[PDB]
Nucleic acid binder design. Structure first.
Lengths: 213, 230, 34, 51, 102, 100, 63, 143, 219, 67, 38, 125
RNA sequence: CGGAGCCAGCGAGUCUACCCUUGGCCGAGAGGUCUUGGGUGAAACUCCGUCGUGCUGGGGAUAGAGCAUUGUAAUUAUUGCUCUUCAACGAGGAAUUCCUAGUAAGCGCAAGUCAUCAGCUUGCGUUGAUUACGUCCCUGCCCUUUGUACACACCGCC
């Protein structure tokens, strides 16, 4: 048929480079394990806000996303998960610890549910983000709520927030750690099991909006 | 064909708190309780309708609204109900001054009134009460709003007199296997039953008669006991 | 197992409280240019 | 459910401290607070009349 | 190239080249009964006398991955599926086996 | 309308119907202007110099100096308004393009 | 319940809305000509899609 | 190829050389080992009493490979760390001088290091040939 | 009159002020810095943490800010303020002595934010005229003549009492009320370059240890 | 008339298409009374042309011979 | 003995009413000093 | 005598000087190889100038990097910047300009902070 | 708990036979001792074995025993270290304050600059986010109410 030759000598270097590292020059995988192609966002209106189309090697892109309004809609969603994981007074700044426990939770997500953990966390985002909410229409403070819709950036924000703080309180004083509780949370949120803090909170917010619609 | 349990010796039920937002339970919230303290010169008291002529009128308020006796006799009824012994209930109260108190199932509220008054003074000023056996902390002032402490799947109803009347047994077996039930009952002497409009999606009632507070609590508890086979 | 590719083992654990393993085992570049 | 009895003091007063059952550690805490306020007032007054 | 031996209240993985205990699993409360590897050899299930199946990952005894609370009776045999990867079959002294999705 | 900026310190506006210079915009600093940019919805004219590092923002309806945008550390070589979303882009000899 | 998707075509300005809530004008995707005025909670801009649990309801103000 | 100590990582050189100085046994463990704490700030002695001296000997061999010439004060200030001293804020402490002098005398009479001018002790020739060889066999066995 | 490094833009242009704290401030210093940024108008506050002072000065004087107020504390109680005027201008740095703040005392409402009137009491020397110019070119030129807030810098033996008042003018006099922080600040140093260097030539700094120190004012 | 010219393009943009259709009914009735048509011609022209220019995509997709 | 400098003035009711009726006089006759526009 | 090229990579206070010259293909950071650059979770941040363009660009040149200052993550960002713009400058000066701007296009499509740092900050609002 | 790898930037007037240091040796430890000359190094972090939700081993206040360094002379125990003793204490109500990118927060290291500060103050780097970036709906503060300034266009007597 037709084939292109574009290297003309088997490439060998003087510094020995590991075989999986030099295998990573044909496709960029997260932590050299998890592929970014065939990772779709199975809910439209959240594609163009959960970003999985520039593959990365680690969740530590030091780029600047907090100086325009919707610029954090194209931080990769693994890194948005990581950044939301490193928040409380105890664990502020510790992005390498957050990256390391994201690596551990994607390994154990894959070893429990034998599928792509990036696809699992993307399904967890698109199942967790609430599609309706209530504002408090004031009237000076008349305690009545009015149901509003909710924009997709707010849905991705509140999805990552619900998932991460659900993993924290689920790891609060049990035997499991943050990596294992976050793995359980992301798996249950991906399949949508109503056993997770995150989609129970989504179902409560959507049900209250349905109530005082 | 089905075997027995491996251990027939009866364990005590796991006492539930706000640190367990998973288990199906019954929350009872005593709203608009009259729990305020005051100085005498040398002495601190809890404001009654009877410890004063006009301490409440010097504070501005009226004497008919200083009734801690009725939240006392609700708390006695809820904590002597069998559902509390079975461990399917916890009691939150919220003062008319906006103070939320979490009440453990394991507490022994004192039976006479002024013992409860001296308990409420130290609870309101030390924000915490330990046991005599001092191993756990079983009556404590916690942070508002109550929805931070209620379980994540929890239908929140309120109790009144002017509402579509239901039956507690079929109403509680309507709800599903992990949903709890948070019942805001008003511990006023009188007042509009709108004390919890911002938390509640269903306003129901239990009788066609003007129902007292602890009688409404005991009615809902006995209905819950019949619905959960206790 | 079937694909052991190395030192091959038979192990038997006894009710006496001990474990028995029986295994079967398995000049110059100028001179070279010359 | 087990049923514990609540520990609390009768005739509670927040402004008074708690009644410690030892008269030689409550006394040293009382007199530590006493020397702290009297030492603070004393040296405040002598530095302001020095000024 | 490694094998797990279930003694009482510990499971020891031996290596098939030195025959010494490379790794050991000692945080069981009662007598551990069964211990098998998954078909991918990545994680290790152990049924315990309290009916608590605990599955760790192999070659890491400190990360208990999940603790299935099976019957109150002792669980005497625990093994993963040999075709499927994400189902674990545990039979116990309850005269009923269970298939668990992990 | 047609706008022009010169080295004598002035931007000025020209009606191409009555052929009159109806508007003249100066700064306050006596600088000479090297490039300009107008709004699409021509409320605001904008001009940059090669000796001042600021951008001068004038209203066209009134004549006043609406703003002086500061932040370049080099002479503002070029200005252009986006024709659709009306964002200002200036670019200067401090190796920097900047979006206002 | 069948849900529907609706793309923003215009963020309505100078409406007297309550703060943190912005009115918006969305057209549908199954018939991309008919619009409806909704009012959303988070930050919204043009041509992004948002999810309507119902579409039988026009939005009033909030205030 | 080109083998060294720079070519191999922390763990894969240090515990491999620790296995070497374990199964050679020409070490003279101090005897008051199993008692001591490697510092004043570790509430107790090391968890692998049958060999932590060999691991420490390998560690000071690697560290004296990479640096030029150190002494026991340098090794103490190196191996020290912070301390949870109590309710007060934390200030840095030193390591254990007797253990450090014991391990340096041990591998002195082994023959890896030797006393240099200016003071302190550097790698000897036989130890210099010895140290990178076990890293070469580290990559050889972990091919 | 307006002196030689303020005369180019004396009344032509409004000022632009940054107000910033020392480093990792306490909460009362953050309240104090908010009080200073809404003491004088067209001032904004900047969260100093992990800011170097040379590149902070450079970013200010290429963004176009006129001057900088850096505040130093002592366990809540603020103790110093440095005013650095940026187009290679002067830094007057002061110590603050009797500070009482409205965030400490009373929810008495909100402030007024009008371009205020300014009172300067007996700044008689040329150093007094210098510190008057550096203190009043951080205010907005030309208020309305019925503006109802005034502030006062009154010299009381090298201790500038600083207060802020609102007023109405009634039938028999004028009725005053005290808003905002009261101080007595005192200049311990002027120098002629910005805050970045401390290699700038000193126009004045007080000589604490000379034996004729307490004989004169603005020594 | 009593809405102002600065917020007229917002007042006409807030209203949905059902109110646009009844606005067209209002204009259709008002240009039969030719007294208050001619006293408000540029106002009717400005409002009507902005309304259908803004709502043009939906208007040309309505299918009714009455409209 | 002797001291370096006059210490910081303790603000009293009489000195606060001193500068208070001072600024009463000042803002009564409006003889204050601001900037002027160019 | 050799064709050689020197570039610089900077983040906060780390700074890395990279000398690229023709050779056999060895990439050495601080004397040690590139496969030793700790904290070992950002070793792929260091690797991505190699894996973005292929190792066949590095098969004929040897790089050495000297990194001072900074912390762990500032040093890996300085290393990757120095490696990237050193490869670009070598292919500019001693290989063809078409491979030069192909390398610039690949690095700029991944992130231009491999080639241009974000340097002078803050903003006084 | 027990080992190991590693990464900064400010700063630069000394007791010069008793100060500060490089190195040898003694003691588990602190510290001692003898010679040399007059800043190297951070912590959080990373890795490697072990434990395990329980006043927990988290804690260390309190009391005892022992070894020293120091204050004449311990003579109210000068302070360091070693082993026991394991009290209190479980993240903190109502209210309230501050905060928008190298920012909040974590982390250590230096200095001590005529005022202030050592019951601390100011520097310096290391790690580094979440959420707004819209709106005048609420709370306030401000501005204007001839368009003037020159066309075109809009407005058309607060």
């Amino acid at each position: 048929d037709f084939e292109v030759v574009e290297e003309f000598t088997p490439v060998v270097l003087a510094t020995p480079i590991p075989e999986e590292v030099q295998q990573a020059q044909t496709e960029i995988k997260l932590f050299n394990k998890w592929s970014f192609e065939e990772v779709e966002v199975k809910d439209a209106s959240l594609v163009d806000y959960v970003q999985v189309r520039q593959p990365i090697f680690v969740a530590h892109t030091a780029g600047r996303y907090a100086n325009k309004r919707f610029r954090k809609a194209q931080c990769p969603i693994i890194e948005r998960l990581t950044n939301s994981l490193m928040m409380n007074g105890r664990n502020n700044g510790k992005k390498l610890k957050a990256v390391r426990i994201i690596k551990h939770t994607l390994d154990i997500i894959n070893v429990l549910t034998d599928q792509n953990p990036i696809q699992v966390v993307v399904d967890a985002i698109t199942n967790t983000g609430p599609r309706e909410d209530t504002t408090r229409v004031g009237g000076g403070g008349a305690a009545r709520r009015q149901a509003v819709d909710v924009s997709p950036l707010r849905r991705v924000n509140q999805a990552i927030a619900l998932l991460t703080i659900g993993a924290r309180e689920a790891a609060f004083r049990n035997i499991k750690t943050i990596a294992e509780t976050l793995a359980e949370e992301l798996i249950n949120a991906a399949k949508g099991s109503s056993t997770s803090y995150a989609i129970k909170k989504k179902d409560e917010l959507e049900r209250v909006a349905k109530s005082n619609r | 064909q089905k075997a027995l349990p491996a251990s027939l010796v009866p364990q005590a039920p796991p006492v539930l708190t706000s640190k367990d937002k998973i288990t199906k339970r019954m929350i009872v919230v005593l709203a608009m309780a009259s729990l305020e303290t005051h100085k005498i010169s040398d002495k601190y008291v809890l404001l009654n309708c009877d410890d004063h002529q006009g301490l409440l009128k010097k504070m501005g308020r009226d004497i008919s609204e200083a009734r801690p006796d009725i939240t006392h006799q609700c708390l006695l009824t809820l904590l002597d109900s069998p559902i509390n012994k079975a461990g399917k209930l916890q009691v939150y109260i919220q003062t008319s001054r906006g103070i939320l108190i979490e009440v453990n199932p394991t507490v022994r509220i004192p039976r006479t009134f002024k013992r409860f008054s001296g308990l409420m003074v130290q609870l309101l000023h030390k924000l915490s009460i330990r046991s005599v056996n001092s191993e756990e902390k079983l009556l404590k002032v916690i942070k508002n709003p109550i929805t931070d402490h209620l379980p994540t799947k929890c239908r929140k109803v309120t109790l009144s007199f002017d509402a579509p009347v239901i039956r507690v047994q079929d109403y509680i077996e309507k709800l599903d296997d992990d949903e709890s039930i948070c019942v805001f009952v008003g511990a006023m002497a009188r007042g509009k039953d709108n004390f919890a409009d911002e938390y509640v999606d269903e306003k129901v009632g239990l009788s066609n008669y003007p129902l007292s507070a602890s009688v409404a609590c005991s009615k809902f508890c006995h209905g819950a006991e019949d619905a959960w086979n206790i | 197992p079937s694909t052991a590719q190395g030192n091959r083992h038979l192990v038997a654990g006894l009710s006496s409280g001990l474990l028995a393993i029986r295994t079967k085992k398995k000049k110059s570049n100028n001179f070279q240019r010359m | 459910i087990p049923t514990h009895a609540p520990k609390y003091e009768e005739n509670f007063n927040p402004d008074k401290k708690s009644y410690d059952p030892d008269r030689t550690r409550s006394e040293i805490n009382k007199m530590k607070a006493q020397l702290k306020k009297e030492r603070k007032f004393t040296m405040k007054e002598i530095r302001k009349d020095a000024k | 190239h490694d094998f797990a031996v279930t003694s009482s209240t510990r499971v020891q993985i031996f290596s098939s080249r030195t025959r010494q205990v490379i790794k050991t699993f000692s945080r069981f409360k009662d007598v551990v009964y069964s211990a098998s590897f998954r078909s991918d050899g990545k994680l290790l299930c152990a049924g315990d006398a309290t009916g608590l199946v605990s599955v760790y990952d192999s070659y890491n005894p400190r990360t208990i991955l999940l603790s299935i609370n099976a019957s109150t009776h002792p669980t005497h045999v625990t093994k993963f599926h040999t075709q499927d990867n994400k189902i674990l079959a545990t039979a116990s002294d309850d005269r009923v086996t269970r298939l668990w999705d992990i | 309308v047609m706008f022009s900026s010169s080295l004598d310190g002035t931007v000025r506006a020209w009606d191409l119907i009555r052929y009159r210079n109806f508007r003249t915009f100066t700064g306050t600093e006596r600088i000479q202007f090297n490039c300009l940019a107008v709004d699409p919805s021509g409320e605001v004219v904008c001009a940059g110099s090669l000796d001042n590092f600021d951008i001068h923002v004038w209203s066209v309806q009134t004549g006043q100096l609406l703003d002086a945008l500061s932040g370049h550390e080099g002479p503002v070589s070029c200005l252009s308004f986006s024709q659709e979303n009306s964002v200002l882009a200036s670019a200067s000899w401090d190796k920097t393009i900047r979006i206002w | 319940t069948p849900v529907t998707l609706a793309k923003v075509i215009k963020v309505l300005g100078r409406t007297g809305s309550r703060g943190g809530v912005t009115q918006v004008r969305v057209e549908f995707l199954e018939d991309t000509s008919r619009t409806i005025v909704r009012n959303v909670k988070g930050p919204v801009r043009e041509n992004d899609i948002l999810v309507l649990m119902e579409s039988e309801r026009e939005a009033r103000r909030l205030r | 190829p080109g083998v060294s100590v720079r070519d191999v990582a922390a763990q894969d050189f240090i515990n491999a050389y620790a296995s070497f100085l374990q199964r050679q046994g020409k070490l003279e463990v101090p005897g008051y080992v199993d008692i001591v704490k490697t510092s004043s700030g570790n509430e107790m002695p090391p968890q692998d009493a049958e060999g932590w001296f060999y691991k420490r000997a390998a560690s000071v061999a690697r560290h004296i490979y990479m640096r030029k010439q150190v002494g026991v004060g340098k090794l103490n200030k190196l191996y020290g760390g912070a301390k949870s001293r109590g309710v007060r804020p934390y200030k840095h402490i030193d390591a254990s001088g007797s253990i450090n002098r014991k391990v340096l005398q041990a591998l002195e009479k082994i023959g890896i290091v030797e006393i240099s001018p200016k003071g302190g002790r550097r790698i000897s020739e036989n130890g210099q040939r010895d140290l990178d060889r076990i890293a070469a066999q580290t990559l050889e066995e972990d091919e | 009159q307006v002196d030689d490094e303020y005369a180019a833009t004396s009344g032509i242009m409004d000022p632009r002020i940054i107000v910033t704290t020392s480093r990792d401030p306490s909460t009362r210093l953050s309240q104090f810095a908010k009080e200073i940024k809404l003491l004088f108008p067209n001032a904004v506050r900047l969260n100093r943490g992990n800011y170097v002072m040379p590149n902070l000065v450079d970013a200010c004087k290429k963004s176009g800010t006129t001057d900088l107020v850096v505040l130093h504390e002592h366990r809540g109680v603020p103790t110093s303020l440095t005013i650095s005027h940026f187009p290679h201008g002067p830094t007057a740095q002061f110590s603050l002595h009797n500070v009482v703040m409205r965030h400490d005392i009373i929810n008495a409402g909100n402030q007024s934010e009008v371009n205020p009137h300014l009172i300067f009491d007996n700044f008689t020397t040329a150093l007094g005229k210098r510190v008057v110019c550096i203190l009043k070119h951080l205010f907005n030129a030309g208020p309305k003549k019925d503006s109802e807030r005034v502030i006062t810098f009154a010299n009381r033996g090298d201790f500038i009492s600083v207060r802020q008042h609102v007023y109405v003018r009634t039938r028999e006099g004028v009725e005053i009320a005290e808003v905002g922080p009261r101080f007595e600040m005192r200049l311990f140093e002027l120098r002629l370059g910005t805050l970045e260097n401390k290699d700038a030539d000193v126009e004045w700094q007080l000589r604490r240890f000379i034996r004729t120190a307490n004989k004169k004012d603005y020594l | 008339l009593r809405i102002r010219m600065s917020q007229l393009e917002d007042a006409l943009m807030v209203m949905p298409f059902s109110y646009v259709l009844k606005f067209l009914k209002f204009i259709d009735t008002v240009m039969q009374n030719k007294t208050l048509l001619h006293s408000h011609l540029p106002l009717i022209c400005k409002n009507l042309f902005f309304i259908i220019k803004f709502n043009h995509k939906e208007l040309v997709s309505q299918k009714n011979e009455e409209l | 003995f002797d001291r370096t400098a006059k210490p910081v003035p303790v603000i009293t009711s009489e000195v606060t009413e001193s500068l208070e009726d001072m600024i009463r006089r000042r803002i009564q006759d409006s003889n204050f000093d601001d900037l002027q526009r160019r | 005598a050799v064709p050689s090229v020197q570039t610089f990579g900077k983040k906060k206070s780390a700074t890395a000087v990279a000398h690229v010259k023709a050779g056999k293909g060895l990439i050495k950071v601080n004397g040690s190889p590139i496969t030793l650059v700790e904290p070992e979770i950002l070793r792929f941040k260091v690797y991505e100038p190699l894996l973005l363009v292929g190792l066949d660009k590095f098969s004929n040149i040897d790089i050495r990097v000297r990194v001072t200052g900074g912390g762990h993550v500032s040093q890996v960002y300085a290393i990757r910047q120095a490696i990237a713009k050193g490869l670009v400058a070598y292919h500019q000066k001693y290989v063809d300009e078409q491979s030069k701007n192909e390398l610039k296009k690949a690095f700029t499509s991944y992130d231009r902070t491999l080639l241009i740092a974000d340097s002078r900050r803050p903003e006084p609002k």
